[PDB]
Design a protein around this ligand. Sequence first.
Ligand SMILES: *[C@@H]1O[C@H](CO)[C@@H](O)[C@H](O)[C@H]1NC(C)=O
Length: 181
Amino acid sequence: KCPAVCTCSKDNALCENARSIPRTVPPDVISLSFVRSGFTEISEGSFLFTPSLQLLLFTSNSFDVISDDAFIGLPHLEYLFIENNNIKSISRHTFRGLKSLIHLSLANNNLQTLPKDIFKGLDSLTNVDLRGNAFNCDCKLKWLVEWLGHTNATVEDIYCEGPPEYKKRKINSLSPKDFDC
Ligand SMILES: *[C@@H]1O[C@H](CO)[C@@H](O)[C@H](O)[C@H]1NC(C)=O
């Protein structure tokens, strides 16, 4: 029953070089990991048939887009780790539908931006790891500083690489009074 592209441990399954997201994952598996996967995108409703997942991991993947509602149908997901990936586009409602999500890590994806209200609706969120990215200080990321002021969750210090004059400036220290838009 363990998917061909995956190897299953005691309560966990790990998939390497998977050409597609398997929908036949055993129900007893509560966390899933995708490493160097073949598929280039996460379309909406991909995890609908694996509702038992409490933790999800994506590492060493190259993703064109992670679209809206990709993680819909994951009510029990408390942990989502997307790290060490090449992600060209992340969508506003990507994480919509995860109200049990506790720890979310987008660290080390070399992302240059995040869409507004990407963390809206994540109520159980106690920690967010945005470190290790290529964020550029702009007006469109403006919302982020506001979200960093009014957020419960613990978010470690992150910095914008550009513009070159404002390189390595503390995103957490940044305030609405600093950027003119
Ligand atoms: C975090 O938010 C919840 C409601 O979503 C609230 O009950 C709780 O007091 C907040 N934690 C704080 C303010 O430390």
